[PDB]
Amino acid sequence: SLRRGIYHIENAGVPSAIDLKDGSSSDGTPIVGWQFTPDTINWHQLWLAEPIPNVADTFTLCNLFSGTYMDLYNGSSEAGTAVNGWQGTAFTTNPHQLWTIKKSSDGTSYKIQNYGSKTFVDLVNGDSSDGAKIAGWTGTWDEGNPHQKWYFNRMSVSSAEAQAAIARNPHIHGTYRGYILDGEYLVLPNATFTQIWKDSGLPGSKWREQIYDCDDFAIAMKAAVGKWGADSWKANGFAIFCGVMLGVNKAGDAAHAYNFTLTKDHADIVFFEPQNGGYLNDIGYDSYMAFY
Amino acid sequence: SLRRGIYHIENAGVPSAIDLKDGSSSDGTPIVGWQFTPDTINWHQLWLAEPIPNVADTFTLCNLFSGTYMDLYNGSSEAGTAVNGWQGTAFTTNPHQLWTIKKSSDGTSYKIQNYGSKTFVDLVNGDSSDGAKIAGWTGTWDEGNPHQKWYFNRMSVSSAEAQAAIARNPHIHGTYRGYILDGEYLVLPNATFTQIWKDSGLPGSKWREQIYDCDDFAIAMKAAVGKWGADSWKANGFAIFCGVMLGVNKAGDAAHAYNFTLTKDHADIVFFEPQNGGYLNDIGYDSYMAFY
Ligand SMILES: C[C@@H]1O[C@@H](O[C@@H]2[C@@H](O[C@H]3O[C@H](CO)[C@H](O)[C@H](O)[C@H]3O)[C@@H](O)[C@@H](CO)O[C@H]2O)[C@@H](O)[C@H](O)[C@@H]1O
Ligand SMILES: C[C@@H]1O[C@@H](O[C@@H]2[C@@H](O[C@H]3O[C@H](CO)[C@H](O)[C@H](O)[C@H]3O)[C@@H](O)[C@@H](CO)O[C@H]2O)[C@@H](O)[C@H](O)[C@@H]1O
Ligand SMILES: OC[C@H]1O[C@H](O[C@@H]2[C@@H](O)[C@@H](O)O[C@H](CO)[C@@H]2O)[C@H](O)[C@@H](O)[C@H]1O
Ligand SMILES: OC[C@H]1O[C@H](O[C@@H]2[C@@H](O)[C@@H](O)O[C@H](CO)[C@@H]2O)[C@H](O)[C@@H](O)[C@H]1O
Ligand SMILES: OC[C@H]1O[C@H](O[C@@H]2[C@@H](O)[C@@H](O)O[C@H](CO)[C@@H]2O)[C@H](O)[C@@H](O)[C@H]1O
Ligand SMILES: OC[C@H]1O[C@H](O[C@@H]2[C@@H](O)[C@@H](O)O[C@H](CO)[C@@H]2O)[C@H](O)[C@@H](O)[C@H]1O
Ligand SMILES: [Ca+2]
Ligand SMILES: [Ca+2]
Ligand SMILES: [Ca+2]
Ligand SMILES: [Ca+2]
Ligand SMILES: [Cl-]
Ligand SMILES: [Cl-]
Ligand SMILES: [Cl-]
Ligand SMILES: [Cl-]
DSSP states (O other): OOOEEEEEEEEEEEEEEEEGGGGOOOOOEEEEOOOOTTTSOOTTTTEEEOOOTTSSSEEEETTTTTTTTEEEEGGOOOOTTEEEOOOOOTTOOOGGGGGEEEEESSSEEEEETTTTTOOOOEEEGGSTTTTTEEEEOOOOOOOOGGOOOOOOOOEEHHHHHHHHHTTTSSOOEEEEEEEEEOOOEOOOOHHHHHHHHHHHHHHOOOBBBTTTTHHHHHHHHHHHHHHHHHHHOOOOOOOOOOEEEEEEEESSSOEEEEEHHHHSSSSEEEEEEEETTEESSSSSSSSEEEEE | OSSSSSEEEEEESSEEEEGGGGGSTTTEEEEEOOOTTTOOOTTTTTEEEEEOOTTTTTEEEEEEOOOOEEEGGGGSSSSSSEEEEOOOOOOOGGGGGOOOEEETSSSSSSSEETTOOEEEEGGGGGSSSEEEEEEEEEOSSSSOOGGGGGEEEOOOHHHHHHHHHHHSSSSSSEEEEEEEEEEEEEEEEEEEHHHHHHTGGGOOOOTTTTBBBBBHHHHHHHHHHHHHHHHHHOOSSEEOEEEEEEETTTSSSSSSEEEEEEEETSSEEEEEETTTTEEEEESOEEEEEEEE
């Protein structure tokens, strides 16, 4: 079962992602195949998959940027029927916006079936060009046809996953306590994490004893990532990953406040120094408290 | 012994405060008597008293706004010698900027003696007018003369004091843990706390599930108060009081994130709801974690 989360959905035959054209929130905006850049935010190509209660392997798919939903036009089972962005809600009963998502016969990619029509999401002709039509099409669950197979590249972590990555880290103090604030988090490439840091004004901030010292830099970075998230995305039901940590050095006589993010494989944390933009596997401190 | 801290220093004969004229950072800016408004930030009238190591009852006095120091002009013991703001440092050995501060014979107000000259800070003639000269003057430790007596009205809390106020509160969960970030904090009137909230843009922020929910409002308020502190005051060695709390309701099935401040008498906390600007003695939650 596909987990609740944010996905970049990539065709299995050609390197085209499921893209809501121009990120537009208009009803009837085409969903199309489009090329992508790895290790970036692909602004029109992120999809929040929300499981429907008691309806096995079935989801709404909400574009993270537009807040509108993947919609099979009038629910038609006719092959070639347009797939578009359309207004909706996370737990809608409109079958046009409900999608059963299960592993394909290659066991890695998925097929995406409309719950009402029983047709599948199809990159028409396998066309690799930017703006290629995606449509609902006749098919089967087991066939090999790559036009209807899709890698769900997971871009978020659950809170349990984030906690797991922290608990793997060797620089955690014995007295550590962690405070979880949300449920599901977009993990940022470092290029983006750094951009938010730059755009916050923190690179220009001077360290000043107590009035703007390490704890202020760290809390300000976290607030800047929270503001970026709300100002950047129209969908709801997720947060952006940026932690704050307090830590103590090995001698026990100095403490520090700093940020952390997650590795690209989502398995480990990496520390960020908000006073200079540096990423570190070892910041010189063991964390006694985190919130994220 | 006067404690390290921030003080509003008020003459004992007439309701004039020790005021650095126009808040100016220029060397030789006059320090004068001036009227004040209670329960406000008196922008030119706050003084950070820093104890000198191993020199009993002796301090520098740093104006919070200008970052310059109370200075007896050329250290002269002549009565009438100007007291002005002047560049310096917190632990200076320049006796012009060193002040022995001890209780007067009324046991409540203090006298302020220059360490080099042995003369006292004097509101000349007891003049109550705005801009009245303050000078160094001959005197004694024990006399009653109100021209040389000063109420040190304490405007900050230590971290121990803040912790004490939290521990007095009845809405603290059994599992509570508190994380202290700084050492000495300016306590804000609510009028100012509210102003910072308004100026942060938070009153216009919409609640959104996970992406801008209670935890984001609370962290954003705290960051806005930290930015205000640095952008507002030139002195260093103190912070501004604004806490974040996470709490749980009595049924144990809902949690919330919010802010808190201190009462005017510095003895108790008051909760602030950053989603609507309200102050509450009981927010409906018991705090399991705080940072401040
Ligand atoms: C927000 C916008 O994003 C980029 O343009 C999108 C575009 O993005 C994809 O394709 C480009 C090449 O055209 C790169 O591979 C990106 O890595 C992709 O994410 C598509 O999403 C189309 C169609 O919806 O819309 C464009 O706006 C970027 O090129 C823009 O400068 C801008 O940052
Ligand atoms: C920053 C500035 O503050 C106020 O003017 C100060 C003034 O403030 C004191 O006296 C006024 C009346 O003149 C009120 O009692 C205030 O409550 C006091 O804090 C003095 O500090 C003088 C001399 O240094 O400078 C003025 O700038 C206020 O009146 C201004 O509007 C402004 O907010
Ligand atoms: O058009 C507004 C509606 O949009 C969604 O439903 C429609 C559906 O009623 C039908 O017109 O088909 C279109 C295209 O397939 C949409 O699925 C919402 O689910 C409705 O609540 C309503 O907003
Ligand atoms: O047209 C019927 C078939 O449709 C699906 O496959 C085709 C594929 O063979 C190629 O013609 O391209 C189109 C559009 O891209 C479809 O992917 C089913 O997968 C086949 O089983 C059959 O129904
Ligand atoms: O003028 C710059 C200096 O200011 C302070 O000391 C002077 C002192 O040397 C003498 O000129 O008297 C004036 C007025 O009383 C000041 O106290 C600093 O302490 C010096 O470091 C220097 O900056
Ligand atoms: O002038 C000598 C006295 O100075 C101090 O008192 C005077 C006070 O009597 C009145 O004259 O006003 C001036 C300026 O405000 C001084 O406060 C000492 O307190 C006296 O003991 C005596 O030295
Ligand atoms: Ca939350
Ligand atoms: Ca601080
Ligand atoms: Ca600190
Ligand atoms: Ca949140
Ligand atoms: Cl096949
Ligand atoms: Cl096939
Ligand atoms: Cl007397
Ligand atoms: Cl007297």
